[PDB]
Amino acid sequence: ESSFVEKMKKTGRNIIVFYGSQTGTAEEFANRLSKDAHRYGMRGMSADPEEYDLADLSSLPEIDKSLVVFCMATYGEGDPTDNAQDFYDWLQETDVDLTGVKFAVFGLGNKTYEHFNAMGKYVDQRLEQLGAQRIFELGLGDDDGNLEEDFITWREQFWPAVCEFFGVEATGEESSIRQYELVVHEDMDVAKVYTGEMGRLKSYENQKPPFDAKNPFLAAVTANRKLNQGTERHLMHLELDISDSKIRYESGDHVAVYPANDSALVNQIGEILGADLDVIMSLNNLDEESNKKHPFPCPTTYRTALTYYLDITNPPRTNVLYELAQYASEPSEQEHLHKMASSSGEGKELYLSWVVEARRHILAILQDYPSLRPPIDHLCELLPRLQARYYSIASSSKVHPNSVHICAVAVEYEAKSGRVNKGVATSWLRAKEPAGENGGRALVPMFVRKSQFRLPFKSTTPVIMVGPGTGIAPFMGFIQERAWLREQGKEVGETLLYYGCRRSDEDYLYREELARFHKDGALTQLNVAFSREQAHKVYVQHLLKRDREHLWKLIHEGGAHIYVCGDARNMAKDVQNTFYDIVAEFGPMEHTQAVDYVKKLMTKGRYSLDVWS
Numbered sequence: 001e002s003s004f005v006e007k008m009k010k011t012g013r014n015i016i017v018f019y020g021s022q023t024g025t026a027e028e029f030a031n032r033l034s035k036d037a038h039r040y041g042m043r044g045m046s047a048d049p050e051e052y053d054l055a056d057l058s059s060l061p062e063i064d065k066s067l068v069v070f071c072m073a074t075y076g077e078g079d080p081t082d083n084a085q086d087f088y089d090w091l092q093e094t095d096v097d098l099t100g101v102k103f104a105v106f107g108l109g110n111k112t113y114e115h116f117n118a119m120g121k122y123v124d125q126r127l128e129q130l131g132a133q134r135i136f137e138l139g140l141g142d143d144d145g146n147l148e149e150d151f152i153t154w155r156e157q158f159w160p161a162v163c164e165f166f167g168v169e170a171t172g173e174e175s176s177i178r179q180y181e182l183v184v185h186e187d188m189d190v191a192k193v194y195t196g197e198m199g200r201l202k203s204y205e206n207q208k209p210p211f212d213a214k215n216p217f218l219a220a221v222t223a224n225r226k227l228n229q230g231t232e233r234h235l236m237h238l239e240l241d242i243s244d245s246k247i248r249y250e251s252g253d254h255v256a257v258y259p260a261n262d263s264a265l266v267n268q269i270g271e272i273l274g275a276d277l278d279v280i281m282s283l284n285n286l287d288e289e290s291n292k293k294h295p296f297p298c299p300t301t302y303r304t305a306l307t308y309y310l311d312i313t314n315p316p317r318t319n320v321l322y323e324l325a326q327y328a329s330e331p332s333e334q335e336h337l338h339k340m341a342s343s344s345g346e347g348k349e350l351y352l353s354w355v356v357e358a359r360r361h362i363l364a365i366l367q368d369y370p371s372l373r374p375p376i377d378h379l380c381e382l383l384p385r386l387q388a389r390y391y392s393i394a395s396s397s398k399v400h401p402n403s404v405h406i407c408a409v410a411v412e413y414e415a416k417s418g419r420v421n422k423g424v425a426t427s428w429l430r431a432k433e434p435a436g437e438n439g440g441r442a443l444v445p446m447f448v449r450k451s452q453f454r455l456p457f458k459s460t461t462p463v464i465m466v467g468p469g470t471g472i473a474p475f476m477g478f479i480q481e482r483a484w485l486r487e488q489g490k491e492v493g494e495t496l497l498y499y500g501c502r503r504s505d506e507d508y509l510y511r512e513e514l515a516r517f518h519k520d521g522a523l524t525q526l527n528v529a530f531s532r533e534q535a536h537k538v539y540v541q542h543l544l545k546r547d548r549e550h551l552w553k554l555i556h557e558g559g560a561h562i563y564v565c566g567d568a569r570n571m572a573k574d575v576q577n578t579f580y581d582i583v584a585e586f587g588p589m590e591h592t593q594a595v596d597y598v599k600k601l602m603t604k605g606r607y608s609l610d611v612w613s
């Protein structure tokens with residue numbers, strides 16, 4: 001049962017697509033590949049590599065006309081994902097030989113980091129070295145531009161390749177097989193019906209420790225406020241009560257929240273679809289010998305599925321539109337939906353400029369294409385899961401640990417579709433009234449994630465903190481940690497803040513807080529780079545360059561640690577370049593030597609990054 005080659009033997013399937021997903025994209029890609037395998041006379045399913053050992057690749061060739069496909073991503077400095085760590089270290093430690101096995105590898109990654117599909121290349125090269133056989137070239141899938149484009153091109157070029165390598169036919173077209181079947185329930189008590197729980201049944205009522213991604217803890221929003229004095233952007237501050245929850249964290253860590261989707265969106269989707277949203281149901285996988293029982297845990301109603309378990313806000317993938325094409329009554333709209341999932345042609349640019357660029361969700365695509373009324377169960381089938389959203393902690397463990405803090409920006413923009421598009425978690429927390437009073441709490445589920453973004457072990461070490469926008473939250477955690485250390489008697493070295501904002505009267509975050517921090521000596525020097533008040537634009541890297549004379553001496557003698565967090569599009573790169581210039585000009589040192597010195601700094605942990613984009 002544990003081994004999956006036996007499951008191949010019983011199910012009669014031959015092609016496997018592995019996924020190393022954490023945010024769901026690789027899982028969906030593997031599921032799509034396994035579904036598409038039926039179109040070419042073959043049968044297979046996508047299986048998660050965590051519950052299955054990889055020693056079964058030796059027994060894999062025992063299946064005639066077999067194949068295995070890998071769709072893996074990576075995080076950090078080329079580190080494996082949580083599910084793929086066992087695969088990675090087994091690959092590291094393995095010494096067996098795999099002769100006659102056939103494989104393919106698709107890589108998921110981002111161009112902005114140096115380890116660009118590190119895991120895909122590593123798996124391909126390790127399989128080749130170990131003695132396996134390549135069939136199709138590696139997929140250089142980059143998330144910097146469009147990721148669906150690369151995968152669709154790789155699939156369109158790969159299926160004919162394996163088809164000609166194996167000699168099978170491809171007569172069948174537009175099969176569009178289903179993966180789950182509807183099971184309605186008429187009389188079923190709410191005791192065994194999910195009402196928003198992620199893991200155990202009825203978890204949201206009587207929680208037990210520990211609490212993590214699978215079993216979040218609902219915190220109570222004690223208070224919140226609008227930090228910025230302007231009105232163009234709603235920069236908000238949250239305080240979540242963590243009393244008696246046993247959650248132990250540290251400053252600079254990450255708090256993750258499971259949002260609830262907009263009720264208006266679900267109501268409008270149900271109204272336009274014309275279905276009873278309060279129908280208790282279930283979706284059962286046809287392949288019984290699969291660990292994915294349902295796309296979301298069931299039984300549950302339609303309303304719960306579209307509120308707490310589905311993602312109806314981000315643009316749909318090409319496979320969803322292709323699977324929904326046949327439900328379009330009007331031939332032209334059906335043809336548009338069919339060609340939307342192509343590899344080139346005018347339909348490709350139409351998809352690019354109509355779904356992703358215009359940011360059209362499922363409701364928008366339904367409204368703009370009125371001759372399209374797909375069944376609600378099919379829409380719940382196709383749509384991806386709802387992903388948790390993570391925020392940096394603005395509190396400290398050595399200071400009040402009973403509550404965590406969140407600095408967030410309310411997402412609101414005028415999408416090119418002409419529709420007001422609203423963020424899920426930011427606006428969900430924005431609508432969370434502090435309440436309190438008699439019994440209202442406005443509960444919010446959450447769990448904490450550990451990270452390496454930490455203060456130095458000894459308080460004597462100077463700390464340099466640079467980040468604009470909402471990046472001040474871990475910096476504030478560090479600041480009040482240092483303030484607590486100073487007020488506790490122990491001396492604390494130099495602490496520097498390098499912050500940026502547009503205007504002092506528009507989005508200056510925590511004027512009073514950092515004012516008192518500087519006036520009390522906790523923050524030795526505050527440095528704020530206004531971005532719109534003066535005629536030109538002065539950013540944080542300008543302040544770094546201007547303080548270079550102190551910064552170089554601090555790094556050389558005090559062993560100061562560098563912390564950077566915020567947006568990664570331009571800020572991190574220019575901060576890196578400024579640090580290169582400062583460490584090279586004051587060496588004197590060459591560019592390559594300065595880069596090597598900075599990498600050596602990172603290897604010791606004195607340089608840290610907590611960027612996000």
Ligand SMILES: Cc1cc2nc3c(=O)[nH]c(=O)nc-3n(C[C@H](O)[C@H](O)[C@H](O)COP(=O)(O)OP(=O)(O)OC[C@H]3O[C@@H](n4cnc5c(N)ncnc54)[C@H](O)[C@@H]3O)c2cc1C
Nearest residue numbers: 389390391392407408409411413422423424425426470612
């Ligand atoms: C490690 C990590 C740490 C983070 N820390 C923080 C933190 O400390 N504070 C914080 O506020 N957030 C933080 N985030 C971001 C947070 O997790 C969410 O991504 C963010 O709050 C987006 O809002 P949402 O949750 O509603 O997402 P969504 O509703 O998915 O909205 C975001 C989506 O909308 C798009 N979008 C947004 N604005 C526009 C626009 N003007 N034009 C076009 N597209 C647009 C984005 O590209 C993205 O696709 C962090 C993320 C990570 C991964």
Ligand SMILES: Cc1cc2nc3c(=O)[nH]c(=O)nc-3n(C[C@H](O)[C@H](O)[C@H](O)COP(=O)(O)O)c2cc1C
Nearest residue numbers: 021022023024025026073075076078109110116117
């Ligand atoms: C926190 C974070 C770290 C990442 N690190 C890497 C990386 O080290 N190398 C890389 O190629 N891509 C990296 N990426 C990009 C992801 O690989 C890319 O978004 C991919 O589509 C994610 O696949 P998934 O949805 O299956 O998790 C990172 C993305 C995030 C959010």
